[PDB]
DNA sequence: GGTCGGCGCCCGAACAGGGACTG
DNA sequence: CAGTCCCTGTTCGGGCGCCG
C-alpha cells in the first residue's frame, strides 16, 4: 500500500542489454533457491522474451560468511540512471567519517525489499539465470521492489531511512552515519568495546522496523606511500642512472626536482658497475630532492564534479601500490598493500582484494567509487575475479599494460 | 477464430515505424502449387486467415524443400518486418553438450511436430504478418493471408517458442523433480533413474501433459531404444560420438570449399583429438572471393592428409561422473597451436578441443598456455559448472619464475606438471643487476619522418663503436636495430643501456615469437647469451654515452 | 534455397588509444 | 603547442560449421 516514486532513465538512452556470463554450479544452485524464495515473497516475478533488457547476476560470500548473497551487476543500469540519484535525491557525504577512530559497515540491503518499485521502471531490472550445460533456456526474472545494488534504491529509501535513524542519531549525536549502496557506515571515536555495543544497539534499532553484518575499519590508521630515494653510501654508474630516471619521472609531480648536478656525474661512457663518487654539488641536489618529496604537492584538491581514477602496480613479493587521482600527476592519495590473501600464490585474488580495499577507502573519504586501471589482461580478469569478490558493490574498470619503467612507487 | 490454450506473448513494433509494405516476388509454378496446398490446409486448421483491403501491409513469401521428404516448408521474407519489430532478449544462452550428461537408467527422446505452428501469435500483432500468394496467372489478384501462429522466418519466433515451451514444462518438472529434461527448441531429452516400468509411465504422462496445450508428440519421432540421435550425436548407454562427418574431396579447391572444410574440422575437434587447421586457414588470409580457386600448399596438403587419417579411426566420448574429479591436459602441437583433452579416467575423454589464436605481435609459449587454460576453464564451467584440474607441460619452477616476475597479474588454477615434450620454458632470463666485467653498450637510434632514413649504433666503455645507415625505417625500428647491433658485437655477457621505452617493453616480456623479423633476430641473439642486463635512461638528459650515441645517430 | 535464433572458428577492416617527434 | 605518425590492441562484421 506504499506509493511508488517515479523513476526515469537519462534522456536519450535505452536500458541495459548485457549478456549473462557462465556461472559455476554452487552459484546457480544458490541463485535458484534465493530467487524461488524471493518469488514466493513477491519480491520478483518471472518475465518473457518481450523484455529486451538484461543484467548479469551472480552470487558471493562476504568475508567470513557461510550464506550466499545474490548480487546483480547494475553498473550499466546505474550509468543510465545517473541523473536521478545525484540531482533530485542526492545523499550528502560527511567529511568527518574519514576522521573517526573506528568505522563499521552494515549490510542493510534487506530493507529495500519493503518498498515497491515504479511499474514503468521494472522493465529495466531484468536478469537471466543460466543452467549448467544449457539444459534449460534462460530463466528470466524482474524486480518488484527496490533492487539491491541499484543506485536508485538508497535514494528512494533515504526518506524512510532518516526517520529510522533519527531516534538513534538523537541519543548519539557524535556518531556519523553514511549510506552508500546496500551498506551503512557508522563511525565513532569511542573505544573499541563500547563502539561495538553501540552497533548492536543500532542493529536491534533496525530489527524493530523490519530489517545484520560486521566489518570494522580504522581510517585514522590509514597511511600513504611516498616516493623514496635510496640511501646508498657507495653509488655505481647504474645506481645513478636509475636515480636520475626516477627523479626525472618524479619531476612531473614535484616541479622543483633537478637532475642537473647528478647528470654531470654521467658524462663519460662508463661501465655500469663502476663506482662513482658524489660531487659536492650533487650531494646537495640529492638531499634537496629528498626534502621536496617530503612536501605535499602544490595545488592538489578533490573536485566533486570529477570522476576518481585508480591505478595499481604489481611490485612483486606480495607488494601492490596504488594511486588515486582525478587529473594526471595530481594524486589525491597513494598507498601500498602487502601480505593480502593469496600472496605468493595467486595474483588475481590479491588484485581483487586490492580493488575492494581501495574502493572501500574511496567511499569513506569521498563517497565515490573510482574507475580502476587494472594491470591484468581482460580475459584473465573476466575469468577469475568473481571467484574472489566479497562486496555488494562493483566499481568500473579498464585494462592496461604498462611495462615497468623505473620503479617510482616502490623501492 | 478459436482461442489457443497457450498464453500469447505481447509483441510491439519499434515506436514510430509502420508495418511492412513490400511487393511479392515472381514464383515458379511448382512453388505456387506447394504454397496454395499448404495455405488452404493451414486456413482450415485456423493458422492463417483471409484478409481484405483493410490490411495495407504485405511481405514476400516463398518455399524451400524439406530434407528427405516430399513435403514443403513455408518461409516468409520478414527482413523488412524484423527491422521494425521490437528487440527480443533470446533465452538460448548456448548449446548443450553430451559430455555434460550424467548416466541415467532410462532415456527417452521425442520431438513435437510443427512446433512453431502449435504456439499462437499475439492478436494485436497478426496484422503486420500479411503476405500475398501469387496465383498461376500474373493477372489474378492473388490470395492474402495473415498469420495466427509463429511464422517461420520471424526474429521473435524462436525466442517466443523457447520461453513458452519452458512455461508448459514447469508444472511437470515441479511434480517430477527427479526427471531430467533437456529442452532445446522442439527437442526433449528425457531421462531418469526410475525403473523402466515407471519411466514409460512418466513419458506417457508428459505426452499427455503436452497434448493438453496443443503440442503433439508423434510416435514417428519417438525414440525408446539406444542409440539415440540427439543434437548431432549418437547416444549409447556408455559412450557417445558425433554423427558421421563427411569432408569434401575436391580436386580443385575454392575458398568456399576450404571454409566448409575448416568448419567441419573445427566441429570434429571436439572428440577427434589432434585436428590441426593452421595451414588450411593460412589459405583464407588476404583472399577476396569465395569464387576464387586456390591451390593447396605442401604444408596444407600434409595437414589435410593427417586430418583425414584421424577421421578414419572410430572415436567416442564418455559421460560426466560427478563423483570423480575433472582433468584437462594440454599439449604443444605446433607453433601457435595447442590441443587438450578433458577426462576423468585415463584415455576416456569426455571431449577434446584446440586453441590456436595468436594474440599480439609479440608473445611466448607461457602466454599462449595461460590463454589456453582460460579458454578451457570457461568452456568447462559452461558444460560441467566446475574448473578441471590441469596437467600442464610446463615445469613448476618455470611457471613460478614467470608469474612472479611479470608485471601483469597472472594466475593458473590448481595444476600439476606432466613430462610430455615439447616442454614449455622461458628461453632467456634478463638479469636484475648489472653484470660485473661485462662490456657496457650505450645504444640509440633515430630516423627522419620524411626521408625514412636513419642510423642505429652504440658506444661502449671499452671504446668500441658502430653506426649503421638504415633506409625505409622508423624511429622504433632503429631503436630496436641499435639493440640488435649491441647483441651481435658483444660477448656472452653484455650490459645494454637504451632510452627506448618501446624496445624495452617488448624484450622484458620475454617473447619467443614475433611477427617482426627484427624481433625474432633479437630473440635469437638473446638465447645465445649467458647474461644480459637491459636498462633504461631518459633521453636528452646528457646521460653517459647515451648522449654521445644520440648525437651520432641524430640524422 | 538465399527465413530466424543460438553457439563455435578465422580473417580483415575499422576503430581506439598511447606514446614520441615536429610543424 | 596541437597535430600527425608509428605501433599495438580491440571490436565488429563477414564468411563457414553445428543445432532446432
Curated annotation (Swiss-Prot), chain B:
* Superkingdom of origin organism: Viruses
Reactions accelerated catalytically? Endohydrolysis of RNA in RNA/DNA hybrids. Three different cleavage modes: 1. sequence-specific internal cleavage of RNA. Human immunodeficiency virus type 1 and Moloney murine leukemia virus enzymes prefer to cleave the RNA strand one nucleotide away from the RNA-DNA junction. 2. RNA 5'-end directed cleavage 13-19 nucleotides from the RNA end. 3. DNA 3'-end directed cleavage 15-20 nucleotides away from the primer terminus; DNA(n) + a 2'-deoxyribonucleoside 5'-triphosphate = DNA(n+1) + diphosphate
Q: Give any extra note attached to this record.
A: Error-prone enzyme that lacks a proof-reading function. High mutations rate is a direct consequence of this characteristic. RT also displays frequent template switching leading to high recombination rate. Recombination mostly occurs between homologous regions of the two copackaged RNA genomes. If these two RNA molecules derive from different viral strains, reverse transcription will give rise to highly recombinated proviral DNAs.
Full-length numbering of the shown residues: 600 to 1153 of 1447
Q: What outcome is documented for mutating residue 479 to Q in this protein?
A: No loss of polymerase activity. complete loss of RNase H activity
Q: What is this protein called?
A: Reverse transcriptase/ribonuclease H
What positions carry the motif Tryptophan repeat motif?
Answer: 399-415
What result is annotated for mutating residue 300 to L? 68% loss of polymerase activity. 10% loss of RNase H activity
Query: Gene name, please?
Result: gag-pol
Where does the record place the RNase H type-1 domain?
A: 435-555
Amino acid at each position: 500500500p506504499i506509493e511508488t516514486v517515479p523513476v526515469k532513465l537519462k534522456p536519450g538512452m535505452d536500458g541495459p542489454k548485457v549478456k549473462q556470463w557462465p556461472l559455476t554450479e554452487e552459484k546457480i544452485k544458490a541463485l535458484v533457491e534465493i530467487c524461488t524464495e524471493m518469488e514466493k515473497e513477491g519480491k520478483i516475478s518471472k518475465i518473457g522474451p518481450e523484455n529486451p533488457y538484461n543484467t548479469p547476476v551472480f552470487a558471493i560470500k562476504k568475508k567470513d560468511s557461510t550464506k550466499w548473497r545474490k548480487l546483480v551487476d547494475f553498473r550499466e543500469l546505474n550509468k543510465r540512471t545517473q541523473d536521478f540519484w545525484e540531482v533530485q535525491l542526492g545523499i550528502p557525504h560527511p567529511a568527518g567519517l574519514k576522521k573517526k577512530k573506528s568505522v563499521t559497515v552494515l549490510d542493510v540491503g534487506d530493507a529495500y525489499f519493503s518498498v515497491p518499485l515504479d511499474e514503468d521502471f521494472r522493465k529495466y531490472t531484468a536478469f537471466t539465470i543460466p543452467s549448467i550445460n544449457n539444459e534449460t533456456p534462460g530463466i528470466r526474472y524482474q524486480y518488484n521492489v527496490l533492487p539491491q545494488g541499484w543506485k536508485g534504491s538508497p535514494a528512494i529509501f533515504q526518506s524512510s531511512m532518516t526517520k529510522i535513524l533519527e531516534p538513534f542519531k538523537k541519543q548519539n549525536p557524535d556518531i556519523v552515519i553514511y549510506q552508500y549502496m546496500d551498506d551503512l557506515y557508522v563511525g565513532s571515536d569511542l573505544e573499541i568495546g563500547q563502539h561495538r555495543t553501540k552497533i548492536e544497539e543500532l542493529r536491534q534499532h533496525l530489527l524493530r522496523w523490519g530489517l545484520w553484518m560486521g566489518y570494522e575499519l580504522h581510517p585514522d590508521k590509514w597511511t600513504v606511500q611516498p616516493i623514496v630515494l635510496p640511501e646508498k653510501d657507495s653509488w655505481t654508474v647504474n645506481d645513478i642512472q636509475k636515480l636520475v630516471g626516477k627523479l626525472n619521472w618524479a619531476s612531473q609531480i614535484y616541479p622543483g626536482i633537478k637532475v642537473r648536478q647528478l647528470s654531470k656525474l654521467l658524462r663519460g661512457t662508463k661501465a655500469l658497475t663502476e663506482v662513482i663518487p658524489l660531487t659536492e654539488e650533487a650531494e646537495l641536489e640529492l638531499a634537496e630532492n629528498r626534502e621536496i618529496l617530503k612536501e605535499p604537492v602544490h595545488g592538489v584538491y578533490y573536485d566533486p564534479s570529477k570522476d576518481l581514477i585508480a591505478e595499481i602496480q604489481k611490485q612483486g613479493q606480495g607488494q601492490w601500490t596504488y594511486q588515486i587521482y582525478q587529473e594526471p600527476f595530481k594524486n589525491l592519495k597513494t598507498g601500498k598493500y602487502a601480505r593480502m590473501r593469496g600472496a605468493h600464490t595467486n595474483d588475481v585474488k590479491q588484485l581483487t582484494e586490492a580493488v575492494q580495499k581501495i574502493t572501500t577507502e574511496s567511499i569513506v573519504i569521498w563517497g565515490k567509487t573510482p574507475k580502476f586501471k587494472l594491470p591484468i589482461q581482460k580475459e584473465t580478469w573476466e575469468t577469475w575475479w568473481t571467484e574472489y569478490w566479497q562486496a555488494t558493490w562493483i566499481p568500473e574498470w579498464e585494462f592496461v599494460n604498462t611495462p615497468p619503467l623505473v620503479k617510482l612507487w616502490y623501492q | 477464430v478459436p482461442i489457443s490454450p497457450i498464453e500469447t506473448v505481447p509483441v510491439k513494433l519499434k515506436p514510430g515505424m509502420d508495418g511492412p509494405k513490400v511487393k511479392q516476388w515472381p514464383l515458379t509454378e511448382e512453388k505456387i502449387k506447394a504454397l496454395v496446398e499448404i495455405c488452404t490446409e493451414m486456413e482450415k486448421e485456423g493458422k492463417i486467415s483471409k484478409i481484405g483491403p483493410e490490411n495495407p501491409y504485405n511481405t514476400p513469401v516463398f518455399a524451400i524443400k524439406k530434407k528427405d521428404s516430399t513435403k514443403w516448408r513455408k518461409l516468409v521474407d520478414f527482413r523488412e518486418l524484423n527491422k521494425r519489430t521490437q528487440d527480443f532478449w533470446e533465452v538460448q544462452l548456448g548449446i548443450p553438450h553430451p559430455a555434460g550428461l550424467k548416466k541415467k537408467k532410462s532415456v527417452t527422446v521425442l520431438d513435437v511436430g510443427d512446433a512453431y505452428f502449435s504456439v499462437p501469435l499475439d492478436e494485436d500483432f497478426r496484422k503486420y504478418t500479411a503476405f500475398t500468394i501469387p496465383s498461376i496467372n500474373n493477372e489474378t489478384p492473388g490470395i492474402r493471408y495473415q498469420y495466427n501462429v509463429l511464422p517461420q522466418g520471424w526474429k521473435g519466433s524462436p525466442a517466443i517458442f523457447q520461453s513458452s515451451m519452458t512455461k508448459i514444462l514447469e508444472p511437470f518438472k515441479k511434480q517430477n523433480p527427479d526427471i531430467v529434461i533437456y529442452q532445446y527448441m522442439d527437442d526433449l531429452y528425457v531421462g531418469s533413474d526410475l525403473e523402466i516400468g515407471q519411466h514409460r509411465t512418466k513419458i506417457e504422462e508428459l505426452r499427455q501433459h503436452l497434448l493438453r496445450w496443443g503440442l503433439t508428440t508423434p510416435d514417428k519421432k519417438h525414440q525408446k531404444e539406444p542409440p539415440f540421435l540427439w543434437m548431432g550425436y549418437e547416444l549409447h548407454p556408455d559412450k557417445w560420438t558425433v554423427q558421421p562427418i563427411v569432408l569434401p574431396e575436391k580436386d580443385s579447391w575454392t575458398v568456399n570449399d576450404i571454409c566448409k572444410l575448416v568448419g567441419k574440422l573445427n566441429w570434429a575437434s571436439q572428440i577427434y583429438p589432434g585436428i590441426k587447421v593452421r595451414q588450411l586457414s593460412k589459405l583464407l588470409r588476404g583472399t577476396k572471393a569465395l569464387t576464387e580457386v586456390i591451390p593447396l600448399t605442401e604444408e596444407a596438403e600434409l595437414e589435410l592428409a593427417e586430418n583425414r587419417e584421424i577421421l578414419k579411426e572410430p572415436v567416442h566420448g564418455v559421460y560426466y561422473d560427478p563423483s570423480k574429479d575433472l582433468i584437462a591436459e594440454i599439449q604443444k602441437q605446433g607453433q601457435g597451436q595447442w590441443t587438450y583433452q578433458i577426462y576423468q579416467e585415463p584415455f576416456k575423454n569426455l571431449k577434446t578441443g584446440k586453441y590456436a589464436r595468436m594474440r599480439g605481435a609479440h608473445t611466448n609459449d607461457v602466454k599462449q598456455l595461460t590463454e589456453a587454460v582460460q579458454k578451457i576453464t570457461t568452456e568447462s564451467i559452461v558444460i560441467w559448472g566446475k574448473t578441471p584440474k590441469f596437467k600442464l607441460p610446463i615445469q613448476k619452477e618455470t611457471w613460478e619464475t614467470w608469474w612472479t616476475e611479470y608485471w601483469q597479474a597472472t594466475w593458473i588454477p590448481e595444476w600439476e606438471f606432466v613430462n610430455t615434450p615439447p616442454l614449455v620454458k622461458l628461453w632467456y632470463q634478463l638479469e636484475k643487476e648489472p653484470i660485473v666485467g661485462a662490456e657496457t653498450f650505450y645504444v640509440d637510434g633515430a630516423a627522419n619522418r620524411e626521408t625514412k632514413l636513419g642510423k642505429a649504433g652504440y658506444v661502449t666503455n671499452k671504446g668500441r663503436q658502430k653506426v649503421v645507415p638504415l633506409t625505409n625505417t622508423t624511429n622504433q625500428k632503429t631503436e630496436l636495430q641499435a639493440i640488435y647491433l649491441a647483441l651481435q658485437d658483444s660477448g656472452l655477457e653484455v650490459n645494454i643501456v637504451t632510452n627506448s621505452q618501446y624496445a624495452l617493453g617488448i624484450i622484458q616480456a620475454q617473447p619467443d615469437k614475433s611477427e617482426s623479423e627484427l624481433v625474432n633476430q633479437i630473440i635469437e641473439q638473446l638465447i645465445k647469451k649467458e647474461k644480459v642486463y637491459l636498462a633504461w635512461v631518459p633521453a636528452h638528459k646528457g646521460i653517459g654515452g647515451n648522449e654521445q650515441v644520440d648525437k651520432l645517430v641524430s640524422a
